[PDB]
Amino acid sequence: PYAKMGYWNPDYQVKDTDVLALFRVTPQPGVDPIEAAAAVAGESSTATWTVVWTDLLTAADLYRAKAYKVDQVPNNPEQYFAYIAYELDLFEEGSIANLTASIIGNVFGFKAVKALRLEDMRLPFAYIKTFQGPATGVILERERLDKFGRPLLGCTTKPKLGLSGKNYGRVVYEALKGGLDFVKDDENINSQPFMRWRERYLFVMEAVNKAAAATGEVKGHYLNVTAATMEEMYARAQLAKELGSVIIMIDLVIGYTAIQTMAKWARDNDMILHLHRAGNSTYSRQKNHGMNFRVICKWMRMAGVDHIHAGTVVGKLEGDPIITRGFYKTLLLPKLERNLQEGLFFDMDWASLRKVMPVASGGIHAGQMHQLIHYLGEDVVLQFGGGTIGHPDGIQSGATANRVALEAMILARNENRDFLTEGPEILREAAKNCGALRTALDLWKDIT
């Protein structure tokens, strides 16, 4: 009996210091939603099933998670929303590993619970205040680049793999010079038989400096420092630093501790830290298990990365615009307001942690710029793939078309032009002065 052990408490009063979680729970067939709630709480707080005297040597209640509210999922008879509260003193300050171990680890109950997905978390102010937050953050990043009031523009090198250092640097130089703010290594390109990492870094920095001198802009290429061990990641990060790179990247697969280690390094060394997280992985379209992406956004903003891919709404990524909007808020706002349609179940104060920059990547193209601006706002990196490299006129051309479409769209937005509705005509006025954009717009009208 889990409701009997105290784990269920309809009357519990939530404190400003509690850590709160919201699970989407699927009770094993013929088990009470209330028993299921209790089971999830009763196991992410204690692993006991007998007469255990040693509890009596501690303030035992303090360490028990409290299932305190259960609503039925709207449009889903046999799924429930369970709200669980955890005392702040259970958690190591500053530690994502400890937070995740504690919350999504010991949430067992294989007899009352069939499915479990963690949907959201209320991280209390005093807990959040124990984390660094973004190494750089949106405001500092923009003051470092001197780039204001418009999304940033990037793309990944094409092909992701195979180019020698010199041919890889060629693509990076072409794309930056033609208008991109950033080019990036693929998450897969680390150090391999067909190209080791040091020559990539050296040829890239020549491309980046050549592009700055060709344009009179700060330019950047995300050098991927991902590696198997912390020492190896550091040697890679240290070359980036030494050669004067404005930015590096890491893959989320390195894991939470290496992430926090890097985030402190990036803060200590003035480096923008971009975090790659695969937009469509095996762990994606689950309505049923695991954890919703917005909890990742929370944890990564706390850990202190500067960029994370957050989704786009249009293009090959087909997501609910309103749920996506909820990801952006989590990353960007100083306070989050409960809003069920965005999937935010808690109000939350961000305790003045810096802002993370959303990245939008997918089948996105220049002809969608009105939708991208309208759905994603000005604080976003828009990442285009074969949409730059494969412009029939060259990489520089492809970068130019994307940059002109971006700028013409923000111009229209700032003029209070109804750019969502007049989007195509805005682009077509811009293309009048821009052959590369005209070429791109035609290129992408067999789509529709």
Binding site: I139, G149, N209, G244, L411, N414, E415, N416
Partner: protein, 138 residues
Amino acid sequence: MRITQGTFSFLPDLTDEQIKKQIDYMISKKLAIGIEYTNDIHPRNSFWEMWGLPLFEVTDPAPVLFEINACRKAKSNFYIKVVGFSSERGIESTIISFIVNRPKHEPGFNLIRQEDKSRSIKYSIQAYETYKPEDQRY
């Protein structure tokens, strides 16, 4: 080459009507509005010269536009930009910055390669007109 510092430098140079609508935007965003100029166009030249103080609490574009044109008359062969500063908590920074005058011709930058340890290179860019004194540039 065209220097592409500025929110709208991949667009053609803005007309005064366009400039006017950008002031309106800034006004509706409640920004301080400053005018800055320079003839050292290095991307890391963070402090352009100020043309007056920024204007605060403005409600009509006219006076901003008037100073922009007076700066253009006084500094016609300088870069001139307009900057909109936000004082919203957690921003407290520029949120738009765009060019409203460029010199007739931009010769661009020299790239200097000082050879260092192993294969590494320490890089500098130096705007060509900065090889001369300010009153002889552009």
